[PDB]
């Protein structure tokens, strides 16, 4: 079914409040939201094409993994947080992407067009494919919303890492885990149980 709006709205408000004032308590809530009431996987995200970006990364970028994706989404989340907290600062109206840790964590892991799409939701557009800049007036609510989905994305990577750990002896790839998680609305233990049973031949 649909995502729980009340739970999501409450979590969003607490996420913004937290940053305006460790996010582990927020991550526990996010982990609950991502499986709550058997929300369909295709309703977990509305601004990022999460499972498509993940599968593109795992298939196309050889250094990647769910761990690497966690790091890329975390770095992009921090870009968003800085922008909605400090939109007047030159260092966040123009961001550093062609050199520095952004190369190692994001360019290594997400396709260029997915970087561009995610950054566009924050109002960043590039020049010559780089030099991302906020060229129109900031829309902090939109920045907050995509930052929040990058937070959910990093947590969802944590969920899929956990699914894999619970069925780690059966020879599955991370791509196999992603396909179960996007196909089934079960929680983490449900997904791992299904993967185990399938590997055992029990359907």
Residue numbers in the entry: 5 to 25, 38 to 219
Article passage:
The linear ubiquitin chain assembly complex (LUBAC) regulates immune signaling, and its function is regulated by the deubiquitinases OTULIN and CYLD, which associate with the catalytic subunit HOIP. We here show that CYLD interacts with HOIP via spermatogenesis-associated protein 2 (SPATA2). SPATA2 interacts with CYLD through its non-canonical PUB domain, which binds the catalytic CYLD USP domain in a CYLD B-box-dependent manner. SPATA2 also harbors a conserved PUB-interacting motif that selectively docks into the HOIP PUB domain.
A crystal structure of the SPATA2 PUB domain (aa 7–219) at 1.45 Å resolution revealed a fold most similar to that of the extended PUB domain in HOIP (root-mean-square deviation [RMSD] 2.4 Å) (Elliott et al., 2014) and the smaller PUB domain of PNGase (RMSD 3.2 Å) (Zhao et al., 2007). Species conservation of SPATA2 mapped onto the surface of the PUB domain reveals that while the PIM pocket is highly conserved, this interaction site is also very different from canonical PUB domains. The previously mapped PUB-PIM interactions include a conserved Asp-Leu/Met-Tyr (see below), in which Leu and Tyr occupy a deep, hydrophobic gorge on the PUB surface, the PIM pocket. In SPATA2, this pocket is significantly different from both HOIP as well as PNGase structures, and modeling of interactions with PIM peptides derived from OTULIN or p97 would generate steric clashes. Consistently, the SPATA2 PUB domain does not bind PIM peptides (see below), suggesting an interaction motif in CYLD may need to display distinct properties. Nonetheless, the high conservation in this area did suggest that this surface may mediate CYLD interactions, and single amino acid mutations in or near the SPATA2 PIM pocket interfered with CYLD binding. In particular, mutations in the “lower wall” of the SPATA2 PIM pocket (Y114A, T115N, and T115A) decreased CYLD interactions, while mutation of residues in the “upper wall” of the pocket (N98A and T94K) did not have strong effects on CYLD binding. The strongest effect on CYLD binding was observed when we mutated Tyr114, which points away from the PIM pocket, supporting that CYLD binds the SPATA2 PUB domain in a PIM-independent manner. Indeed, the CYLD USP domain (aa 583–956) and SPATA2 PUB domain (aa 1–241) formed an SEC-stable complex, confirming a direct interaction.
